[PDB]
Design an enzyme around this catalytic site. Structure first.
Site, PDB file in Angstrom:
ATOM      1  N   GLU A 101       0.794  -1.225   0.000  1.00  0.00           N
ATOM      2  CA  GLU A 101       0.000   0.000   0.000  1.00  0.00           C
ATOM      3  C   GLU A 101       0.829   1.278   0.000  1.00  0.00           C
ATOM      4  O   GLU A 101       0.301   2.339  -0.357  1.00  0.00           O
ATOM      5  CB  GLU A 101      -0.937   0.023   1.215  1.00  0.00           C
ATOM      6  CG  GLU A 101      -1.991  -1.067   1.213  1.00  0.00           C
ATOM      7  CD  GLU A 101      -3.107  -0.806   0.217  1.00  0.00           C
ATOM      8  OE1 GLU A 101      -3.164   0.312  -0.340  1.00  0.00           O
ATOM      9  OE2 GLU A 101      -3.928  -1.718  -0.010  1.00  0.00           O
ATOM     10  N   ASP A 153      -6.613   9.871  -5.292  1.00  0.00           N
ATOM     11  CA  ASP A 153      -6.203   8.697  -6.046  1.00  0.00           C
ATOM     12  C   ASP A 153      -7.016   8.560  -7.337  1.00  0.00           C
ATOM     13  O   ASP A 153      -7.994   9.277  -7.574  1.00  0.00           O
ATOM     14  CB  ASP A 153      -6.332   7.447  -5.173  1.00  0.00           C
ATOM     15  CG  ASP A 153      -5.389   6.340  -5.596  1.00  0.00           C
ATOM     16  OD1 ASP A 153      -4.754   6.471  -6.662  1.00  0.00           O
ATOM     17  OD2 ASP A 153      -5.273   5.338  -4.858  1.00  0.00           O
ATOM     18  N   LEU A 189      -8.091   5.179   2.952  1.00  0.00           N
ATOM     19  CA  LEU A 189      -8.990   5.940   2.092  1.00  0.00           C
ATOM     20  C   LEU A 189     -10.021   6.687   2.930  1.00  0.00           C
ATOM     21  O   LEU A 189     -10.579   6.133   3.882  1.00  0.00           O
ATOM     22  CB  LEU A 189      -9.698   5.007   1.110  1.00  0.00           C
ATOM     23  CG  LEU A 189      -8.965   4.544  -0.156  1.00  0.00           C
ATOM     24  CD1 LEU A 189      -7.733   3.708   0.162  1.00  0.00           C
ATOM     25  CD2 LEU A 189      -9.923   3.765  -1.042  1.00  0.00           C
ATOM     26  N   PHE A 239      -8.355  -5.730   2.890  1.00  0.00           N
ATOM     27  CA  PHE A 239      -7.826  -4.379   3.049  1.00  0.00           C
ATOM     28  C   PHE A 239      -7.885  -3.611   1.737  1.00  0.00           C
ATOM     29  O   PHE A 239      -8.136  -2.399   1.729  1.00  0.00           O
ATOM     30  CB  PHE A 239      -6.390  -4.437   3.570  1.00  0.00           C
ATOM     31  CG  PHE A 239      -5.905  -3.146   4.173  1.00  0.00           C
ATOM     32  CD1 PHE A 239      -5.393  -2.138   3.373  1.00  0.00           C
ATOM     33  CD2 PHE A 239      -5.945  -2.949   5.546  1.00  0.00           C
ATOM     34  CE1 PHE A 239      -4.943  -0.955   3.925  1.00  0.00           C
ATOM     35  CE2 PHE A 239      -5.493  -1.770   6.103  1.00  0.00           C
ATOM     36  CZ  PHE A 239      -4.994  -0.771   5.292  1.00  0.00           C
ATOM     37  N   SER A 276     -13.648 -19.416  -5.400  1.00  0.00           N
ATOM     38  CA  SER A 276     -12.316 -19.608  -4.837  1.00  0.00           C
ATOM     39  C   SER A 276     -12.379 -19.929  -3.350  1.00  0.00           C
ATOM     40  O   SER A 276     -11.576 -20.728  -2.849  1.00  0.00           O
ATOM     41  CB  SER A 276     -11.458 -18.363  -5.070  1.00  0.00           C
ATOM     42  OG  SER A 276     -11.309 -18.091  -6.455  1.00  0.00           O
ATOM     43  N   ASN A 334      -7.888 -20.356 -10.226  1.00  0.00           N
ATOM     44  CA  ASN A 334      -9.218 -19.755 -10.259  1.00  0.00           C
ATOM     45  C   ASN A 334      -9.161 -18.266  -9.938  1.00  0.00           C
ATOM     46  O   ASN A 334      -9.887 -17.470 -10.541  1.00  0.00           O
ATOM     47  CB  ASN A 334     -10.169 -20.477  -9.298  1.00  0.00           C
ATOM     48  CG  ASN A 334     -11.630 -20.094  -9.533  1.00  0.00           C
ATOM     49  OD1 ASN A 334     -12.248 -20.522 -10.513  1.00  0.00           O
ATOM     50  ND2 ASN A 334     -12.182 -19.279  -8.641  1.00  0.00           N
TER      51      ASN A 334
END
Ligand SMILES: CC1(C)CC([C@@H](Nc2ccc(-n3cnc(C(F)(F)F)c3)nc2)c2ccc(C(=O)NCCC(=O)O)cc2)C1
Ligand SMILES: CCCCCCCC/C=C/CCCCCCCC(=O)OC[C@H](O)CO
Length: 423
Positions: A118, A127, A139, A211, A224, A239
């Site tokens: 990050e 962003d 954010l 996250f 998945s 997958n």
């Protein structure tokens, strides 16, 4: 009987190195054979195994040269003895990198994973998606208003922002975000069962996805998640490559998918570190072994240099090893403080790799370095101390046991293969 004692100890020595050689070749063949065992941890194991295998080769060569100028006067004997000395220093320094790797394995976690992925921001930034962000992936709001974004950050930090936020405030907010992620996962009906079945490493992978995307976001990966809960990692890797997540942010997705597939941190490791390990295990022995050979050839040359009681020449081969043991015990102590911490805080279970790997390495360190420390500066009951030969012979066998044969992952590979043969 005197001669009978020497003969019997000879037998246990040679069968110790026979069992060790066979076990180490079998174990290295297992680690190399199964593709799922190809990780940095097992590569470090393979280098350690090779040092023990070469030590055994030296032992068998010295014994086989006894059959057919005596052997003590030849130069081939001095070369075989120098190579053996190199192998011994290699054992101790690859054990050193074994311990160092263990330490750094205990020091990596989701916080460091996310600080790599990050990034860190000091000032507010708008962003690409329209969201204002700061700190470590924090954010704020998509509202296109720098004024309101700075206010929304001011209430969420406590003080006045003005725009620049210190590193401490960012770490505080980062802890907040990660705790929110885990509370999200445990409050999701499609994510708690699979998270509770995942190991700590794959747990951090799931948290990473949450996250970046969000709690309800990754819950959409029905396909998945089912096969992650079923321990079928490779199917889920292929997958997860067929995703919107993989095509939008590919470099981060491949790291997370590798973490899922293997259960390791290899996709976050720097590759020059492993070259420094190989420069320690094989390189540093070369740095004090060869000057010892030079001074023993020019200034103490009598019977393959077996009469090593004259001068400082014994120290230049025994002070480095002492060094490698001193650090190996300090690591030994520090690691313990860490493990009992992470176990008490329920950051780690006894089923994770970090704990099992510590369970083997913390055994080997006082098993291989305690003699060197105890008799640190002693130059030189006969039968009783001749039992050092038995343990030094069976050393490699124990390495193969603790690092291969009782490892849970390899037992998985054997049962999985038999299952393939049936079905
Ligand atoms: C020679 C013996 C009698 C000793 C050996 C035994 N040693 C051992 C056992 C437990 C702890 N221990 C517990 N808690 C702490 C603490 F305090 F947290 F540090 C340490 N330490 C040391 C051992 C048993 C099991 C394994 C093992 O399964 N390996 C495979 C795991 C792997 O390679 O993937 C290895 C070693 C067996
Ligand atoms: C080649 C000559 C043979 C000599 C070989 C003898 C090896 C015996 C070990 C002694 C340990 C002494 C110091 C170890 C420190 C104690 C710490 C401890 O017990 O470990 C706790 C952890 O739970 C699990 O190790």
């Amino acid at each position: 009987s005197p001669e009978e004692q020497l003969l019997f100890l000879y037998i246990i020595y040679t069968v110790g190195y026979a069992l060790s050689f066979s076990a180490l070749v079998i174990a290295s063949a297992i680690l190399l054979g199964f593709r799922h065992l190809h990780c940095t941890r097992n590569y470090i194991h393979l280098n350690l195994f090779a040092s023990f295998i070469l030590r055994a080769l030296c032992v068998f060569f010295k014994d086989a040269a006894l059959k057919w100028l005596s052997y003590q006067d030849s130069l081939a004997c001095r070369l075989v003895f120098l190579l053996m000395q190199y192998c011994v220093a290699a054992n101790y320094y690859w054990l050193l990198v074994e311990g160092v790797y263990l330490y750094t394995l205990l020091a990596f976690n989701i916080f460091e994973m996310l600080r790599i992925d990050e990034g860190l921001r000091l000032k507010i930034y708008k962003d690409t998606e329209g969201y204002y962000t700061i700190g470590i992936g924090h954010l704020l709001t998509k509202s296109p208003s720098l004024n309101a974004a700075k206010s929304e950050l001011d209430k969420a930090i406590g003080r006045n922002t003005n725009g620049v936020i210190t590193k401490d405030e960012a770490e505080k907010l980062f802890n907040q975000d990660v705790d929110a992620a885990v509370r999200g996962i445990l409050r999701n009906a499609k994510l708690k069962p699979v998270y509770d079945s995942l190991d700590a490493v794959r747990r951090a992978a799931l948290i990473n996805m949450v996250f970046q995307m969000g709690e309800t976001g990754v819950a959409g990966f029905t396909n998945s998640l089912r096969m992650l809960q079923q321990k079928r990692w490779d199917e889920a890797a292929v997958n997860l490559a067929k995703s919107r997540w993989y095509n939008q942010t590919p470099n981060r997705a491949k790291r997370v998918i590798t973490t899922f597939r293997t259960g390791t941190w290899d996709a976050y490791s720097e590759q020059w570190i492993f070259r420094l390990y190989v420069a320690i295990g094989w390189g540093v022995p070369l740095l004090f072994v060869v000057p010892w050979g030079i001074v023993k050839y020019l200034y103490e040359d009598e019977g393959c240099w077996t009469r090593n009681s004259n001068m400082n020449y014994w120290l230049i081969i025994r002070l480095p090893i002492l060094f490698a043991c001193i650090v190996n015990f300090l690591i030994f102590v520090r690691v313990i403080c860490i493990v009992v911490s992470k176990l008490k805080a329920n950051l780690m279970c006894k089923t994770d790799i970090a704990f099992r790997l510590a369970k083997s390495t913390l055994t080997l360190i006082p098993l291989l370095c305690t003699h060197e420390v105890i008799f640190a500066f002693v130059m030189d009951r006969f039968i009783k101390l001749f039992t050092e030969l038995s343990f030094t012979s069976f050393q490699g066998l124990m390495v193969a046991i603790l690092y291969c044969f009782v490892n849970n992952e390899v037992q998985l590979e054997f049962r999985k293969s038999w299952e393939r043969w049936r079905l």
